[PDB]
Design a protein around this ligand. Structure first.
Ligand SMILES: Nc1ncnc2c1ncn2[C@@H]1O[C@H](COP(=O)(O)OP(=O)(O)OP(=O)(O)O)[C@@H](O)[C@H]1O
Ligand SMILES: [Mg+2]
Lengths: 268, 124
């Protein structure tokens, strides 16, 4: 596994630059791709080794609702630690729900998104050990050409990638804002995130949009800030949202238990 | 530059101070935390970490630092962690040693805060 050759990448257009580095649209070996270039202070042989051991786990080709990292460019010899994944025309779930200038997805499509993500996460929860530093939120799920929602493996943070900084705390379980991952049931923390995604699909609002990230984490962690359960939705949607966001991690369902509930919601 | 302002410009120095009170309260007030005293309230590292998240748009998980430090050591660690977040944001490594902040050296503290104020003037 020598990775992908950075010299084979055709960079077409820059999409973003942020705290993580940059994202480009491009092409590689007949694939339409994005190229994520990671910027890292005090890059070392140790971090480069870690990058090359962590990336292989993200290359998941066996589930329709998981979007694999296709491969990565090792650095050296690449200028920078780099990974690539397929280009998803609708972008992120976040883009589609909140930045959708063209059409508004209907609630039936919303339900199918929920089902897609539940299925992707039940799959990932079968992995042993779990993929480390994988956070479910609307920025880390992509929407493919046929509107299929897919968990973004290119959104898993690497061990050297902004440690101690959380840029999407609104979807994080209260215990996971405060405790080391080792000290948390990760599977239940992820179900909290799904509960917030349900809330987001119901409201078509960003959770805590009026609060900075630091405010969100501190108030959720220390002051009990919670999403307000939306008014007059079906009791069954309501009950599902409530059970998934149980204050008690041990009482939150598993993804594989909510999949059949969601299936019956498409068409009973 | 900042030395001349500290050592030789007290009428200016107090302008800057009252403003640093404005600035840091602009941000920390959001967390229901007030800074009244610049000489001591940043010594333990906690406000510097919190402030960095406020200024740079992230939350810092509570397990990543000591929210209620119980030693000189944990304070030095908090301050060092803050300086690291500063360099992540593109600041050059601060001149003061982390211990200078914990030891309440006023020049050291005001320098760090001043450099923050300058970089993050438009942040709301
Ligand atoms: N596979 C993809 N296909 C199409 N667009 C994508 C894909 N991945 C990401 N994007 C788009 O690029 C934009 C920027 O993504 P980028 O990864 O730079 O930022 P981010 O996901 O907010 O933060 P992070 O650096 O932590 O991953 C996303 O909002 C999305 O619109
Ligand atoms: Mg991303």
């Amino acid at each position: 596994h020598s990775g992908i050759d950075f010299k084979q990448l055709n960079f077409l257009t820059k999409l973003n630059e942020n705290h993580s580095g940059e994202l480009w649209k491009g092409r590689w070996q007949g694939n339409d791709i994005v190229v994520k270039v990671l910027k890292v202070r005090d890059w070392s042989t140790r971090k480069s080794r870690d990058f090359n051991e962590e990336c292989p786990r993200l290359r998941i080709f066996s589930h329709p609702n998981v979007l694999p990292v296709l491969g990565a460019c090792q650095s050296p010899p690449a200028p920078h630690p780099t990974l690539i994944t397929h280009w998803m025309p609708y972008g992120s779930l976040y883009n589609v729900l909140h930045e959708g200038t063209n059409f508004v997805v209907d609630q039936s499509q919303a339900v199918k998104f929920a089902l897609d993500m539940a299925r992707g996460m039940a799959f990932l929860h079968t992995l042993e050990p779990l993929i480390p530093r994988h956070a479910l939120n609307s920025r880390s799920v992509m929407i493919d050409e046929d509107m299929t929602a897919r968990i973004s493996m290119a959104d898993v943070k690497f061990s050297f990638q902004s440690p101690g900084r959380m840029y999407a705390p609104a979807w994080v379980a209260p215990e996971a804002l405060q405790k080391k991952p080792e000290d948390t049931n990760r599977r239940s923390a992820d179900m909290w995130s799904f509960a917030v995604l349900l809330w987001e699909l119901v409201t078509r609002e960003v959770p805590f949009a009026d609060l900075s990230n630091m405010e969100i984490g501190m108030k959720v962690a220390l002051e009990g800030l919670r999403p307000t359960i939306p008014p007059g939705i079906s009791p069954h949607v309501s009950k599902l949202m409530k059970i998934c966001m149980n204050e008690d991690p041990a009482k939150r369902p598993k993804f594989d238990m909510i999949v059949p509930i969601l299936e019956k919601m498409q068409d009973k | 530059a900042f030395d001349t302002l500290f050592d030789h410009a007290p009428d200016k120095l107090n302008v800057v101070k009252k403003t640093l009170i404005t600035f840091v309260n602009k941000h920390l007030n959001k967390l229901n935390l007030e800074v009244t005293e610049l000489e001591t309230q940043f010594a333990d590292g906690v406000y510097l970490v919190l402030l960095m998240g406020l200024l740079e748009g992230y939350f810092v998980p509570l397990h990543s630092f000591f929210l209620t430090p119980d030693s000189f050591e944990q304070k030095v660690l908090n301050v060092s962690f803050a300086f690291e977040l500063m360099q992540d944001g593109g600041l050059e490594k601060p001149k003061p040693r982390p211990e200078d902040i914990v030891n309440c050296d006023l020049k050291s503290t005001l320098r760090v805060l001043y450099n923050l104020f300058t970089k993050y003037r438009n942040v709301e």
